[PDB]
Design a protein around this ligand. Structure first.
Ligand SMILES: *[C@H]1O[C@H](CO)[C@@H](O[C@@H]2O[C@H](CO)[C@@H](O)[C@H](O)[C@H]2NC(C)=O)[C@H](O)[C@H]1NC(C)=O
Ligand SMILES: CC(=O)N[C@@H]1[C@@H](O)[C@H](O)[C@@H](CO)O[C@H]1O
Ligand SMILES: *[C@@H]1O[C@H](CO)[C@@H](O)[C@H](O)[C@H]1NC(C)=O
Lengths: 49, 49
């Protein structure tokens, strides 16, 4: 949108958080949100237990 | 906790939650700063181990 950057502006996952127990935030970075195109280029595999 | 610039009134007693940390009391029980430290289910020495 004009600024020629893709910019994050909406965060609509939760409305409130009242009873916290754990909080970690990574050391701050700047990853690109740029509109790459063609086919898939990253495989990202995760296991959760 | 122990060094806060103002404490609460007892009728409005605070409740600070603590997690993801290590409990070294060596600047604490080993300091004569308290006119009363008493534990009631542990020896004050055993708090490190
Ligand atoms: C976390 O916050 C909620 C909301 O303030 C607490 O739920 C209240 O709990 C008391 C005591 O059981 C009840 O009388 C209230 O009616 C509850 N309110 C609501 C809106 O649910 C909850 O107890 C808090 N938990 C902790 C561990 O502090
Ligand atoms: C019980 C305890 O650890 N007290 C210390 C105190 O001795 C020290 O002068 C002060 C400095 O900020 O920090 C706190
Ligand atoms: C462009 O970015 C500025 C801040 O850098 C922001 O205020 C503005 O709303 C953005 N415009 C669009 C169209 O996203």
């Amino acid at each position: 949108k004009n600024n020629k950057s893709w910019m994050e502006s909406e965060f609509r996952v939760y409305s409130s958080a009242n009873n916290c127990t754990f909080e970690y935030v990574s050391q701050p970075f700047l990853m690109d949100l740029e509109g790459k195109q063609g086919n898939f280029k990253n495989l990202r595999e995760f296991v959760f237990k | 906790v122990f060094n806060a610039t103002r404490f609460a009134s007892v009728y409005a007693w605070n409740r600070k939650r603590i997690s993801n940390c290590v409990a070294d009391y060596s600047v604490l029980y080993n300091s004569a700063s308290f006119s009363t430290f008493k534990c009631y289910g542990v020896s004050p020495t055993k708090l490190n181990d």
